[PDB]
Design a protein around this nucleic acid. Structure first.
Ligand SMILES: [Mg+2]
Ligand SMILES: [Zn+2]
Ligand SMILES: [Zn+2]
Ligand SMILES: [Zn+2]
Lengths: 34, 67, 256, 98, 98, 44, 477, 528, 115
RNA sequence: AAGACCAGGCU
């Protein structure tokens, strides 16, 4: 089950998913929306 | 913006190779093989096609002000 | 005491490229020849530009800058044309300029690539050298109309008048004169002109030697053939020396 | 006009009580480069006065790890007082403890 | 109608919300533009995050010349409703009596 | 005078005292055609 | 913690902290708390497994994303004062294993150590090979690097807009530039940089530039200036009318002649405008007229790019004019790499006078070697080597900060396979005499930025000009 | 109020009487020009066209002034104004006015600033009186002020976006004052520390050392070029040191022609060991490392910062004291020009191979670091089992910190010494450090071996979290890694924690630089 | 503003003499040649040709300032020979060498283009 | 006009 030293691909994939969902300015938009 | 006509260092014309480079890369050549196929030997001409960013495509999305 | 007797070997000769070796001549001779290859060879390039309509996304002097860098076939009439500073006329004529006209409209939906093929000249010898060289891309409804005059100049004025796409120059491929000092000779790749074995790094030091073969590789940008670039450079350097001899004959005659 | 004035001038409070208010908020967005625009949109300001010669609040604290960029601050009287946000840092928006 | 509230670009109440690349290009808006700024009188204004001390939590400090050896304080606010920024201090006077 | 509209991209005929609305679409932004007088550039 | 990880009745934004020694348990739902995501570690094993990575690699057309990753209890948001109770592992493959047993109670693991940097510091190649003041200097100077700031700039009417002719993405890139969109809007050019003392004009922090390259469009740019003006028709206005003044009819009059103006008193676009030229002819009808016409900034020497006529808030006639000028890099202009090495242009030499390799390559930029030893920017040298490797290989080099899979020996071994000296040195020939240079000069492609500061915007001279009203002293500015 | 008008800075007294805005002043960016003299400054034509100097008409210069008046303000050199005996100020810039262009003795013609004019030149932080020296105008293209590089260290200026002010005296008397008092060659030696202020800096110093080594043999054409770049040369080619196999000159032999007059000086090179003076070879130094100049000939020795730099008893200082200001100027200019033009042949560079050391040296450095870390572990274990005895006058914490700092400093010093010993004679880092041009032995050590301990307010990295530095470390960890000791070098790259600790270390320096300036300036003003 | 026009690298104006000859008073039989609007291309050539003359004692050139387009050549010869004669002879020898090189290069081109 | 705030640059 564990990631067998493929880690460089894995961590940048999850970082790409994070930045694809949120972006860079969510603190502005979330604050104003709330 | 758009591919420069001349390589800045030596002066070789790279303005007519952007479309061919794109075609080869679409035809499954890697960047190194495509640059060799186009005839760009020394690193100064290779960096031109390797590091170019084509913003003119993005600029052509906007409608003109002309009729 | 007396002048050189140099000799030329030519190894490779194509439409792009000329590899030749000059033997038995001075280093300063060779350096000035390779320097004249760049900066003193006359060629034809677009210099005056007037734009009538430009609704593209690139601005007027952007397009004018690209137009000047487009090589023009200069093979024949560059000896026949005058410099504009030499010429007797106050405005542009066939003895001192070539007229180019561009007229492109994008009526169709798909993007049109304006290339050097769309440049139309008044005379058949001096077409653009040339896929073709891309000047600008046009969306539907965009238009580009302009006139251009091409003049005669050389590399000192502007890099658009450079007839050449890099000159390779090399002498003493095996470091026998020790003009360069390798801290570790074993780490340096051997030149394609090296004449020594795979096992030894450098030729033995030659205290009596002087630089003696110059290896050349002149690569043309398309305006002039690489064979005629060298001939034009030699003729121009000889003409410069003859002009000094002439005017220095007058300066001695003043000193007399 | 209250919202418009306080967002235009930058003085944060009543215009008649501008002596009592806070200033420096709502600067003109920097459009020199895309990186400049992003850095300006992700930026933090310490309210501690700029004349303060006390070094302590300016120093890079251990607790900034992963939250605030260690490299990026202006040079001058505002060293360490203007801080930029890390790439993965997220500021909580708040919720009710019901 | 009681007034007009400026709208942060690309927020849930902006007209650019949920639009695609084609729509943004038709509107002469760059898709790469992140938003997160306001437009007031034609200029673009960006609110800078303002750092401040936390509220409702007890803190204990000391400062060298004060009459107190230790000063406990609690900057308190009622859920950011009706906020007075009321601060109590609870201090210990110095030992140095004579 | 003629100005081009900032949305429908048509020409509109207009004079110096006229308020700005486009005759085809009501839109309030106009652009002045590049003039007819010629400007010479060097290709340097 | 179970409920927070299951998102059941506790939002992931809520932080929970147990201080064991003081017997307190604190829960914060408050706004304004800063936090960052972390991977959960159970025992010695990550909760992130290969199926999560497979689904995230097939993220497209699967509606599986970072929110689904959070909902699975794999990643957790942690704020500042909860980190006090957290045992963090820098990387899983290194710190989870049975090395010599420093710790075994790891509870969290960083996604990647390079996520501690900001937006401007994430563009630096090899930032761990540089001095921290130089990293700070680069972070500050990157905001002033010129490029294409926004794609629709031809629509925008902004004052002081700078745009570059031929931006290039760096040949040596950071893994985080993809999320900063630096490929789409680059702010510089890759240039062949030789680190050598050539003629003494690059001493101190100066730079020698290639004039032949500059003539080919190297670091050429455009500067746009916008001008606002209006009829002001409200209140004590009379009217302030756009019209072309006649030569001596108005009161205010100057040696600036109005004849570039059109019928409505507005210069049409495409007209060359120089110093003192009147862009907008506006006359006051004054209780008999005053010229309030606007002029260009002195010596701006530009061309009218766009003219716009609208109606403002009030509903009176309001006009914007945008002027452009091209500005070719000169001696006084400021250039900088991505490492804090900033410098003006000491002198420009043509291609004939520049030193050249055996292949005819001449450097675009020559920088003094004396900038390196004291400033200790080794990342500059490593970038220069990596770019030389990449330009030959056809790939784009990876300069992400803390990756052990890149080192200088490996880069040298890769470069040695392409027929070059493995440390980047190369034999140069003197441009003036053609003789070889005794030393071998370090050369290679490096990413360089043109800065907003130019000498044409800074040069100033004074002799008996304007006088201040109150002090009768020379003006300020 | 009136009190507020007069009270503070920018108030009337300080802001308009003690200092004020002036006319005939120019500002622009400064760029280097090694082809200028040490008293010359390059001035753009636009600034020289704007700036004017009033000149009085007399029978000597009336023809030249009439030619300037007919050139007018359009062509570059002419006049802008003509001032009559009554004070009537005719302006040439708008109209030709051919009846008014007549000149007679007593008029004042305000001509454009020409070559040879005297100007005060200034850089703003203005700390001592060498921050404002009088220069001599030379007119050059483009738009930057140009000055010689030896003049940079008086002004503390570097060519990175720096701007400098230009003041032009408007009267003959004040021109005479600046010429006779504040000219650059008259300010070579400061009264502050009786040392020269200007010295040989950057490329030229490293080239001086490499040129003045023993191995430099110069061929005939190279000698003729270097002599072509001498301004004080008498025109006689010296007889070469080596004659028959081929004629070969030496670098010292040409440097002796640069040295003015008959100067006697004795210095020592930086790499001079103390063993040579004790035993034999006192006067025939094997490393070439003692300097002897007799009768204005450099007999032996390698020049460096200790000989051509700004120090007491330097060659330049002795030259000034013996020969005066006029000859020392030519001495600086000749050194600059001829040695830059020689450096055109040899060249200088820096690269990765200059920063990569030997594989055996790397192993030695790693062994030293491991031994040091083991020693710090054993000291920690001694304190943990309460076996450590407290030093007199010191707390247990104080002595523990002192011992650990001692161990780490010894480790860093030993690794640096090993790295410096591993350097080759061709290494460009060594070539720059030895000559004193730039860089230092600690910079080499940090580049090649070990960055070293990072300190915050002169202490080891504190505990910002409860009992630890970062969440990656365990509580109560006083080991070198946890407290900010950077084991790696810049070439090898730093780990994430070491990178953060180095950022913390540099932040302190930035803060100190930003803060100290106000106090220093306030002290300076109060002293003055 | 102050950018000079592109042509000061190669073109003379009214009043500029292409060559100016000044005698050097420091040393007998020494002369100083000033060539306007030229660069290293010609100075290096002339100096290298002059150094071959056995009757020339000194031969050197320099550019006083790169931003200016000017060459200064100093020639010192032995007592029974004029540096003016040395200069003319060097120029003639250079022209003679270049003509022969051109002819041999043309012959080589013709031999290469067939067989 | 003038005043205010802000941002940036060189030490
Ligand atoms: Mg500086
Ligand atoms: Zn190239
Ligand atoms: Zn004609
Ligand atoms: Zn319309």
């Amino acid at each position: 089950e564990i990631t067998p030293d493929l880690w460089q691909e894995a961590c940048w994939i999850v970082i790409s998913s994070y930045f694809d969902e949120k972006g860079l300015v969510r603190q502005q938009l979330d604050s104003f929306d709330e | 913006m758009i591919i420069p006509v001349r390589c800045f260092t030596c002066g070789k014309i790279v303005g007519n190779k952007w479309e061919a480079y794109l075609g080869l890369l679409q035809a499954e050549y890697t960047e190194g093989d495509a640059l060799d196929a186009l005839g760009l030997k020394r690193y100064c001409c290779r960096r031109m096609l390797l590091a170019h960013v084509d913003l003119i495509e993005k600029l052509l999305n906007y409608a003109p002000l002309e009729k | 005491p007396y002048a050189n007797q140099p000799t030329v070997r030519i190894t490779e000769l194509t439409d792009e490229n000329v590899k030749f070796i000059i033997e038995n001549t001075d280093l300063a001779v060779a350096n000035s020849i390779r320097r004249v290859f760049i900066a003193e060879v006359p060629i034809i390039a677009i210099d005056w530009v007037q734009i009538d309509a430009n609704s593209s996304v690139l601005h007027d002097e952007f397009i004018a800058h690209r137009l000047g860098l487009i090589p023009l076939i200069s093979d024949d009439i560059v000896d026949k044309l005058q410099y504009s500073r030499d010429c007797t006329c106050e405005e542009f004529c066939p003895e001192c300029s070539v007229e180019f006209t561009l007229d492109v409209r994008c009526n169709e939906d798909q993007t049109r690539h304006v290339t050097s093929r769309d440049l139309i000249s008044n005379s058949p010898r001096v077409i653009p050298v040339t896929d073709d060289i891309l000047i600008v891309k046009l969306r539907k409804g965009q238009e580009l109309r302009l006139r251009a005059y091409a003049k005669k100049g050389f590399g000192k004025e502007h890099a658009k008048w450079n007839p050449t796409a890099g000159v390779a120059f090399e002498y003493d491929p095996d470091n026998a004169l020790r003009h360069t000092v390798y801290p570790k000779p074993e780490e340096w790749p051997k030149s394609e002109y090296s004449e020594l074995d795979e096992d030894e790094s450098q030729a033995p030091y030659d205290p009596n030697g002087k630089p003696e073969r110059f290896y050349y590789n002149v690569e043309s940008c398309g305006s002039l053939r690489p064979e005629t670039i060298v001939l034009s450079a030699l003729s121009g350097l000889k003409k410069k020396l003859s002009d000094l001899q002439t005017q220095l004959s007058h300066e001695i005659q003043s000193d007399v | 006009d209250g919202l418009k004035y306080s967002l235009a001038t930058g003085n944060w409070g009543d215009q008649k009580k501008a002596h009592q208010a806070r200033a420096g908020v709502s600067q003109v967005l920097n459009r020199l480069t895309f990186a400049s625009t992003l850095s300006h949109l992700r930026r933090l300001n310490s309210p501690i006065g700029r004349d303060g010669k006390l070094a302590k609040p300016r120093q890079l604290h251990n607790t900034l790890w992963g939250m605030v960029c260690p490299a990026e601050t202006p040079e001058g009287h505002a060293v360490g007082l203007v801080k930029n946000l890390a790439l993965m840092a997220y500021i909580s928006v708040g919720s009710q403890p019901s | 109608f009681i007034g007009k509230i400026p709208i942060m670009l690309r927020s849930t109440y902006c007209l650019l919300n949920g639009l695609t690349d084609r729509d943004l290009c038709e509107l002469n808006e760059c898709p790469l533009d992140p938003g997160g700024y306001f437009i007031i009188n034609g200029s673009e204004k960006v609110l800078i995050a303002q750092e401040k001390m936390a509220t409702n939590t007890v803190y204990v400090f000391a400062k060298k010349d004060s009459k107190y050896a230790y000063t406990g304080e609690c900057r308190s606010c009622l859920e950011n409703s009706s906020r007075p920024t009321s601060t109590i201090w609870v201090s210990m006077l110095a030992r140095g009596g004579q | 005078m003629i100005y081009i509209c900032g949305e429908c991209h048509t020409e509109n005929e207009i004079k110096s005292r006229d308020p700005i609305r486009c005759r085809e679409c009501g839109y309030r932004i106009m652009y002045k055609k590049r003039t007819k007088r010629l400007v010479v550039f060097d290709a340097r | 913690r179970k409920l927070r990880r299951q998102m059941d009745i506790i939002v992931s934004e809520v932080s929970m902290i147990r201080d064991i020694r003081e017997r307190e348990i604190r829960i914060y739902t408050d706004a304004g708390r800063i936090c960052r995501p972390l991977l959960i570690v159970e025992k010695q094993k990550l909760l992130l497994k290969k199926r999560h990575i497979d689904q995230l690699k097939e993220r497209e057309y699967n509606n599986y994303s970072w929110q689904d990753l959070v909902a699975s209890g794999v990643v957790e948001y942690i704020d500042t004062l909860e980190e006090e109770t957290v045992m963090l592992a820098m990387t899983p493959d290194d710190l989870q294993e049975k090395e010599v047993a420093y710790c075994s109670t790891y509870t969290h693991c960083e996604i990647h150590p390079s996520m501690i940097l900001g937006v401007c510091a994430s563009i630096i190649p090899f930032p761990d090979h540089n001095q921290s003041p130089r990293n700070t200097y680069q972070s500050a100077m990157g905001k002033q690097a010129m490029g294409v700031y926004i794609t629709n700039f031809h629509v925008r009417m902004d004052t002081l807009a700078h745009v570059l002719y031929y931006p290039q993405k760096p040949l040596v890139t950071t893994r985080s530039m993809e999320y900063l969109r630096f490929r789409e809007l680059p702010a510089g050019i890759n240039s062949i940089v030789a680190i050598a003392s050539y003629t003494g004009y690059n001493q101190e922090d100066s730079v020698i530039m290639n004039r032949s390259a500059v003539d080919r469009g190297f670091f050429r740019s455009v500067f746009y200036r916008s001008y606002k003006e209006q009829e002001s028709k409200k209140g004590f206005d009379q009217e302030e009318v756009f019209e072309k003044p006649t030569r001596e009819t108005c009161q205010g009059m100057r040696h600036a002649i109005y004849d570039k103006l059109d019928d409505d008193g507005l210069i049409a676009p495409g007209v060359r405008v120089s110093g003192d030229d009147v862009i907008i002819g506006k006359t006051v009808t004054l209780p008999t007229k005053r010229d309030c016409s606007t002029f260009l900034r002195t010596s701006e020497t530009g061309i009218v790019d766009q003219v716009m006529v609208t109606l403002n808030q009030e509903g009176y006639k309001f006009c914007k004019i945008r002027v452009r000028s091209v500005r070719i890099p000169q001696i006084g202009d400021k250039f900088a790499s991505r490492h804090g090495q900033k410098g003006t242009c000491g002198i420009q030499y043509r291609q004939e006078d520049m030193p050249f390799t055996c292949e005819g390559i001449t450097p675009d930029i020559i920088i003094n070697p004396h900038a390196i030893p004291s400033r200790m920017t080794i990342g500059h040298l490593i970038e220069c080597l990596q770019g030389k490797v990449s330009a030959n290989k056809g790939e784009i080099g990876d300069a992400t900060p803390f990756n052990d899979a890149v080192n200088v020996q490996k880069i040298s071994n890769l470069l040695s396979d392409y027929g070059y000296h493995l440390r980047g040195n190369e034999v140069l020939y003197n441009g003036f005499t053609g003789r070889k240079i005794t030393s071998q000069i370090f050369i290679g492609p490096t990413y360089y930025q043109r800065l907003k500061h130019m000498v044409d915007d800074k040069i100033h001279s004074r002799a008996r000009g304007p006088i201040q009203i109150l002090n009768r002293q020379p003006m300020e500015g | 109020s009136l009190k507020q008008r007069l009270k503070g800075k920018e108030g009337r007294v300080r802001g308009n009487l003690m200092g004020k805005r002036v006319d005939f002043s120019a500002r622009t960016v400064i760029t280097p020009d090694p082809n200028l003299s040490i008293d010359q400054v390059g001035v753009p034509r636009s600034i020289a066209a704007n700036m004017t100097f009033a000149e009085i008409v007399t029978p000597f210069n009336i023809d030249r002034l009439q030619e300037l008046v007919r050139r007018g303000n359009s062509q570059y050199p002419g006049a802008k104004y003509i001032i009559r005996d009554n004070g009537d100020r005719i302006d040439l810039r708008f109209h030709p006015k051919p009846s008014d262009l007549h000149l007679q003795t007593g008029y004042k013609v305000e001509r454009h600033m020409c070559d040879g004019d005297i100007v005060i030149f200034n850089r703003q932080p203005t700390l001592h009186k060498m921050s404002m020296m009088g220069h001599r105008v030379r007119i050059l293209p483009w738009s930057t002020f140009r000055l010689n590089l030896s003049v940079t260290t008086p002004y503390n200026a570097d060519f990175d976006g720096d701007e400098m002010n230009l003041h032009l005296p408007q009267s003959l008397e004040t021109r005479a004052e600046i010429q006779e008092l504040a000219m650059v060659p008259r300010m070579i030696v400061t009264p502050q520390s009786n040392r020269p202020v200007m010295g040989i800096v950057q490329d030229t110093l490293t080239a001086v050392r490499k040129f003045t080594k023993r191995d430099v043999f110069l061929e005939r054409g190279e000698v003729m070029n270097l002599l072509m770049f001498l301004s004080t040369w008498d025109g006689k080619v010296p007889q070469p040191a080596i004659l028959k196999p081929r004629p070969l000159w030496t670098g010292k032999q040409i440097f002796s022609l640069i040295i003015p007059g008959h100067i006697n000086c004795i210095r020592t090179h930086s790499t001079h060991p103390d063993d040579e003076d004790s035993g034999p070879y006192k006067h025939i130094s094997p490393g070439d490392t003692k300097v002897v100049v007799e009768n204005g000939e450099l007999i032996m020795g390698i020049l460096c910062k200790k000989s051509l730099g700004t120090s007491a008893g330097s060659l330049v200082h002795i030259s000034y004291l013996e020969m005066g200001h006029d000859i020392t100027r030519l001495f600086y200019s000749n050194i600059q020009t001829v040695i830059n033009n020689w450096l055109l042949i040899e060249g200088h560079t820096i690269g990765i191979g200059d920063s990569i050391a030997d594989s055996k040296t790397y192993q030695d450095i790693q062994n030293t670091i491991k031994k040091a870390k083991q020693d710090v572990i054993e000291v920690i274990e001694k304190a943990h089992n309460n076996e450590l005895e407290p030093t007199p006058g010191n707390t247990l914490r104080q002595t523990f910190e002192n011992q650990v700092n001692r161990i780490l400093n010894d480790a860093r010093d030993k690794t640096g010494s090993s790295a410096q010993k591993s350097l080759s004679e061709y290494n460009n880092f060594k070539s720059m450090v030895v000559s004193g041009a730039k860089g230092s032995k600690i910079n080499i050590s940090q580049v090649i071996a070990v960055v070293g301990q990072q300190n915050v307010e002169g202490k080891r990295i504190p505990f910002g979290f409860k009992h630890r530095t970062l969440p990656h470390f365990i509580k109560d960890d006083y080991g070198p890694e946890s407290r900010g000791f950077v084991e790696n070098s810049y070439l090898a790259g730093l780990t994430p924690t070491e990178f953060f600790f180095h950022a913390m270390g540099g932040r302190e320096g930035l803060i100190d630089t930003a803060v100290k300036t106000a106090e220093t300036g306030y002290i300076q003003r109060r002293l003055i | 503003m102050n950018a000079p026009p592109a042509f000061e690298s190669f073109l003379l104006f009214e009043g500029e003499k292409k060559i100016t000859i000044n005698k050097d008073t420091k040393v007998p039989n020494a002369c100083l040649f000033t060539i306007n609007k030229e660069d290293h291309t010609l100075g290096n050539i002339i100096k290298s040709q002059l150094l071959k003359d056995p009757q020339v004692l000194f031969a050197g050139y320099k550019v006083p300032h790169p931003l200016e387009h000017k060459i200064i050549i100093r020639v010192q010869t032995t007592p029974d020979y004029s540096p003016q004669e040395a200069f003319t002879n060097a120029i003639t020898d250079l022209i003679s060498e270049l003509s022969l090189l051109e002819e041999r290069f043309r012959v080589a081109i013709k031999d290469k283009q067939e067989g």
